[PDB]
Amino acid sequence: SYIEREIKLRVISPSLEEIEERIRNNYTFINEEHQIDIYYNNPIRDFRKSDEALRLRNTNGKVILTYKGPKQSKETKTREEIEVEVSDLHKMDLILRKLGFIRSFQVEKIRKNYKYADFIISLDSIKELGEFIEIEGINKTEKELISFVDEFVKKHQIQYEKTIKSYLELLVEHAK
Amino acid sequence: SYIEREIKLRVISPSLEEIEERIRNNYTFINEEHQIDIYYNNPIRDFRKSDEALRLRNTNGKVILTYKGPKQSKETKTREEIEVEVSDLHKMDLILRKLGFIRSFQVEKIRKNYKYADFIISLDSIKELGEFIEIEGINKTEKELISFVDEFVKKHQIQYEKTIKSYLELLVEHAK
């Protein structure tokens, strides 16, 4: 069991490309991920009602199966997270479909990951949604994370809007 | 999707060690596997009633998740089989437990695998059950497999008893 604690910002201004130039100076680039996500649902235990999730992710060809627990926070996306890498995405999907899970929706993004003193800054560009930033802390308190995010946006003059809604949620509303 | 077609024999005589000496001459040894299996059940879809199975296997440290479909044969264990390798057994078990599956029973064995012209001969020693042999064919018909098994037992003077019951079943009955 690992506890995911992150803050998600919708970027109002400037673009991620401009933000990338402002942080390039003192933020060490890690890698870029092309992530295709398939979310599943248990027909008897709707994860939207229990606030859970089961996700099969393809990130640069690496296949990862992820369960996420209920949100334990209102100011950050605090959740239980358990992940394993699997050998074959198709056969993992088949097993899940054979076990009775149904594919709910798909999410796709390009994520650029930067690091800074136990903080993981992710520049997210979502297909048909827009540009977001996620900051995740390694063994950091909710106050430490909230405080750093405030410093990050001020230092780089970012106009933003916080949200604990997930990309999958944002994608649903945007459809209507 | 792959179709597992195998025949399972309970060895009456001689011991596997003696059989190993008789087949050593013209059967090429592959490897020896120490397999620890955890079987799961869906509380709403008892696999014993649907004739399915979900199994998390540790074979020489390699972790494999396996779904098996219903038996499509009465003279051989003909079943649908879908497998994927996962990175961590504990976390795969946790994910399954978090998704609602319950650990049904555990099975442990030492399996010696031999090969002979598209046939996989497995010498099985089961904890608290006994000695068995399984013969599995790669793209072989039910008649081809049945016929080869008859030749195998005759050539090596094996006293046996065929069965399509699974090790997990045999283990349950043996308890009473």
Ligand SMILES: Nc1ncnc2c1ncn2[C@@H]1O[C@H](COP(=O)(O)OP(=O)(O)OP(=O)(O)O)[C@@H](O)[C@H]1O
């Ligand atoms: N129908 C649904 N089934 C399951 N989970 C859902 C569903 N709708 C929304 N969710 C939510 O999807 C969320 C995805 O979280 P998030 O938006 O952070 O994804 P992500 O940023 O791509 O993930 P990560 O940050 O781990 O890379 C979960 O946090 C979960 O509640």
Ligand SMILES: Nc1ncnc2c1ncn2[C@@H]1O[C@H](COP(=O)(O)OP(=O)(O)OP(=O)(O)O)[C@@H](O)[C@H]1O
């Ligand atoms: N409670 C149960 N839940 C799920 N499956 C069960 C259960 N009881 C019995 N089974 C059966 O367990 C069987 C195991 O098959 P088998 O005995 O060939 O195992 P194995 O020889 O160890 O497997 P493999 O041959 O793939 O290595 C399945 O074939 C399945 O029906």
Ligand SMILES: [Ca+2]
């Ligand atoms: Ca995250």
Ligand SMILES: [Ca+2]
């Ligand atoms: Ca996230």
Ligand SMILES: [Ca+2]
């Ligand atoms: Ca087999």
Ligand SMILES: [Ca+2]
């Ligand atoms: Ca078998």
